[PDB]
Design a protein around this ligand. Sequence first.
Ligand SMILES: [Cl-]
Ligand SMILES: [Cl-]
Ligand SMILES: [Cl-]
Ligand SMILES: [Cl-]
Ligand SMILES: [Mg+2]
Ligand SMILES: [Mg+2]
Ligand SMILES: [Mg+2]
Ligand SMILES: [Mg+2]
Lengths: 374, 374, 379, 379
Amino acid sequence: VKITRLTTYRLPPRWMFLKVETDEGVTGWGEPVIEGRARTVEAAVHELSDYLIGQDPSRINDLWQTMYRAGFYRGGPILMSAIAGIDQALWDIKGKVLGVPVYELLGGLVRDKMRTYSWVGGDRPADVIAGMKALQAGGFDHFKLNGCEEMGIIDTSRAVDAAVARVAEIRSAFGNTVEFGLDFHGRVSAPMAKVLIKELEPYRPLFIEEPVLAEQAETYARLAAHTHLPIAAGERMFSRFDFKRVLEAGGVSILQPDLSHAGGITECVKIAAMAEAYDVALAPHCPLGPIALAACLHVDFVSWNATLQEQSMELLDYVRNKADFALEGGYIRPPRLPGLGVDIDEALVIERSKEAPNPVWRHADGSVAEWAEN
Amino acid sequence: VKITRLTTYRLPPRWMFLKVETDEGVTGWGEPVIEGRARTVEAAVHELSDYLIGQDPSRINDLWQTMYRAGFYRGGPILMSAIAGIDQALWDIKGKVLGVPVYELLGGLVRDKMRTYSWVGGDRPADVIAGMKALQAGGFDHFKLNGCEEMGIIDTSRAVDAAVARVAEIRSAFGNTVEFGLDFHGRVSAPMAKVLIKELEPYRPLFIEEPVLAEQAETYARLAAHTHLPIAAGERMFSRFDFKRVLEAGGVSILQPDLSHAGGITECVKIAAMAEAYDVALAPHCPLGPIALAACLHVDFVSWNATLQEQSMELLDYVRNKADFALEGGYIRPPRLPGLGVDIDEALVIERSKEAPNPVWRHADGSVAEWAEN
Amino acid sequence: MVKITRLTTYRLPPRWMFLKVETDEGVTGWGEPVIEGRARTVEAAVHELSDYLIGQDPSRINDLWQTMYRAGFYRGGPILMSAIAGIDQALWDIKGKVLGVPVYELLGGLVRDKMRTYSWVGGDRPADVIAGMKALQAGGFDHFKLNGCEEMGIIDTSRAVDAAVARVAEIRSAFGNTVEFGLDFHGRVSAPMAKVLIKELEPYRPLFIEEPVLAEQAETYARLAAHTHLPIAAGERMFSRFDFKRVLEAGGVSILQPDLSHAGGITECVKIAAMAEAYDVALAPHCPLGPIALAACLHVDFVSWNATLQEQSMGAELLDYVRNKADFALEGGYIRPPRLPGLGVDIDEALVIERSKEAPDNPVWRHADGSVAEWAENL
Amino acid sequence: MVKITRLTTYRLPPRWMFLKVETDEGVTGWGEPVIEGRARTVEAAVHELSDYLIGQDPSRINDLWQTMYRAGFYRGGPILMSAIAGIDQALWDIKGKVLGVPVYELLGGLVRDKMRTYSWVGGDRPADVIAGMKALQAGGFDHFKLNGCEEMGIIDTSRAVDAAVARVAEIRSAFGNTVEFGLDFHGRVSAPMAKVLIKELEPYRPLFIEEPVLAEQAETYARLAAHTHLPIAAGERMFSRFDFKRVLEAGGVSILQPDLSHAGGITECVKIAAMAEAYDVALAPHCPLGPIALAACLHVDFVSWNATLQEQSMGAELLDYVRNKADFALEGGYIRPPRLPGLGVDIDEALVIERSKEAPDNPVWRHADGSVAEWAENL
Ligand SMILES: [Cl-]
Ligand SMILES: [Cl-]
Ligand SMILES: [Cl-]
Ligand SMILES: [Cl-]
Ligand SMILES: [Mg+2]
Ligand SMILES: [Mg+2]
Ligand SMILES: [Mg+2]
Ligand SMILES: [Mg+2]
């Protein structure tokens, strides 16, 4: 069995799918993070395919290590994202060849179902409430909201108060019936960080995600020593050494490794087991497509320390087996089909790739602002 | 091109200007810190001019290093202040020779405008409010006030309460509409430090500047671990090693390097870039004259991590290009003219130097009190 | 305002990539990213970063650097920082030509008059290395860099330690203390064999041991250095200032070697050099093989007081795309400051284009057991 | 109350500055700031600090010391602490004369009967150094200080390491373990060459290695000391007690050498010596060349139990402005306690004035590459 071809497909949202074909006619699918540097990531995939074409896809460990360390410097945001997509597809192949879901190869189930939380948006606080009340009747009680009331940076007491007032209004609609985490995207100024966290404390969010962009992991420990609220982080980390430093410093209660960024299944299973050695909950980050979500589920269903799973609900378009990702009580069931358990509509992928379409945010003073999402 | 002459000029407030002349007729201006030891600083300048006369002013790096390390022990408060003034003038020369503002030589703009805050005084709390309300209609919303209600030391609960009552009355006049930082000048006793900071917390100042005079940088970290309020410091630091120790200990959210004290542009650009490596905002300290303010602006407009700029508004007297330092919305624009962007009235400098004029504060017990400002 | 119009890349024969940034006032800057091994990815990175550049004023290098670094994506890494490094070199080249001066003049002027260089010497046998060293020595050189291992492969046996030492011993016998050499091991020593190799190399007094192991933790270098009197050199695998700070905070590295074509260019490397000054370390920039990036290195050396040595690769081959070859001539192992405005390279653009037409494109080395060896410069 | 009337400074020929503090009861004290290299700045500092002194009671030395140190300006630094040191010496001189006793009597009395001295020996060649050492040895000396390097310049090569060692080796052969010598390197060793030089000096057993490198971080000394059995001496570049505490907290310095003319005078140096006692360190004050400041050193030695050695520079030249020369005579390398009230110096004021009329006024040394070398005592 040998790898024959790699193809990438840019798709209408901020998605890229890749397809690994083999001489046995077994096809794997992976999904890299691209938001922002789509053409670079695409080039990385095709450069790394030199190490794959005519190799046995079953040696995932060998292929992972070759891509990561054998031909270049160790990967950062671009290469680790490319390696992640390829890794996902090799696992898809392996599970298809052996006729079982990926979690079965990785020791089998450690749980029967997995708790999920959803991201909820809205321009007004009333809009956010409405969306949460909709998903609540659907069966959810765990949510993730943007902490930022408006677009920009939290600079002033006035900006802190407005952000807290929004959170207050949202909390008063539910009390302790629902849980929500707040993601600030690192868009809080260093002087405001501690006062904001303190002002949110009465309204008790489940976590605070990325209050600031840390240069040293000591600042998360310094922030956490001030608050009862759990600090969540991990989406901007790729190396195992990024995670180890964050975990050894402490101050991060909830770790959020992205499957599509941190080197894939091969690597995220290791990050999960490293997280166990510290007193830290695991909540794998994935708001991407269906291939990457499925990849996350396989890590969730083998790692005992995984507690919550992020999903963005769209990703039902390119998948034929939509019912496998149905949610009851805010819980997802294990993938059912061999490999990653996603039946990809290859034809609908091919046709929509034929059409191919992020701005710079700046402060008032004109200075460039650190990257966030929409 | 060669340096021909250095002249110092003592001026009516607590200011000294220096003037570096060249054989091409290109003149640079610098401004050292002197408050207090004016004759010593003046002597330092003229002793260091032995390393300058007949040298190419373009080798600022060489001249800086020669002054700092080649003929004596490494500088403290006096020599670093002298070096700072000379450094500013060599940068003024260089920018004049190449016909561009200083920030252009240092990589160009990282921002379009710079946020400023002003110092506001007043004997009564009502006077302080009035001055703030005046500048607010002018366009300001960021201020810096003395924390000390009266002249002396914060020793007692009665002294803490009076200082907090003053701050309370000021805050109630504005709410969260304006921001203000409190400068205590290190005039709080070590037992009172923590209770005062805690009592000010409801009224949420933007920062607390120099609550105590630290002997070890561990005490700022110990103070900051107790409070949500940001600790600002840096005006009493000269060496890069003073700043590094403060930054590595943590507990200082806002760094305040003085351009006219910490070795000038050559050195403060380095302090700025070092501050980036820690999670610390930069607010360069300058309440002096127009040459030093201009020098600060050039550091602000090249360093991404600079957030607020102190200005004392007088310094419009000796400058012919007053409109270049106009403030809209509490924002300053980049310097426009070559060099530092200050057109110095040399004649008005020369004539007012012909007339040349700080007391010891003591506690009740007779003991000498650590230096502060008026 | 002056506006950037176009970025163009040129893959060239000794696996180099040249970058050309054009402006609408006819002023052109040149940059050089290092591409070894991932040429197409870096090329794609350069063109994607150009989106933040076309139509913008090239004089705002700080703004543009920050925009490329943090605005549209996650920070840093070996691909993006190499791309940013090349753009940075060209932007500063523009700034110097506009203001009619070399880059070092903008960065505060000269801190020295000339810069000590050293070169890498090769050869399979010690006799060859000696001869090459003597050939350069007659031309005034007395500082050198060598590979620590005779051929490709990991040092994981006493036999391999002994053979590496014997080679170095024989090289040392021909010169005594009359020359200095550093030894680069490219991280190809097993962590069990590291301390014994280092110890066995002590009587032969190399100036440094560069990259003995690939350190996962920063404390690794500090533990090696506490065992030996020999200086440890590192830096080429570090891409952000914050990677450099960590290693400097741990101690154990005596000589820091930032790459100008990898660690974000002049803008970031002047800050790295400044950061290193607050530690007891010597600075010796890991300079890439090409001339544009060599020029970038020199500008950093001529403004950083703590810069002591400068690696370069001269033959007869580096000076082919450069018309002003005499500006980079060496006397007594020293290079003069760049003379022409900007980076100080007059680039033969017509040769660059000519040879970009004829340039084609990953050597993966494996241990005897079949597992991949971590990548080395030997490729 | 008794009032200070006047301060007067006197620049004198071997680049010394004497300070004279007068009172309205006719009691005069003498002090000595070290000025090397910034004479006019320190002179101006002394006269500006006099503003806090004129009209004040000289007996309140603690109040006055604190006033000069913290009241009117930012603290400390090499200029102000040297000026404060000179004023402190004179104030205590006043106090001792008023109470009719030596300074050590005020500071708790004698802790020893005599103080072990050592002297610096010079000479370009080892043969000269040996001869000078033998000349002092015949006079009962057995402890010495030498410069570690043959001439001015940085040790940055194996060749320079080897030559420095060979010199020390040859000096050691003439004596064996019969004499002790320390080696001062004045911070003129590159941080890569530091550990190898120190290691190569171990068989020749110097009593200490003084200032091998200029430590940016305090951890530098601790890292050097963990490699060697040789004691590291430091202290001359430290001006505040808090600089001393940091270095002592880091460890790695076995012998602390505070300068009495630089670190705030007697008032601060007795506290520095007290602070050092709580660490496993020997105290050996870096005494300046002049006699007034030498007297100040002795008073600290004769009250501090942890003071072990005392550096002095005797010919034939130190004793010129001192009338009571026999009070500072040496027997077997030992000095007796000062005998006269105050600091114990009878100052020939009329010679001081005479020679102050005829005294004129910065040697900047550069590396081969043209950059400035960090300042050394050799100037
Ligand atoms: Cl990467
Ligand atoms: Cl000073
Ligand atoms: Cl990257
Ligand atoms: Cl000083
Ligand atoms: Mg997030
Ligand atoms: Mg202040
Ligand atoms: Mg190398
Ligand atoms: Mg000495």
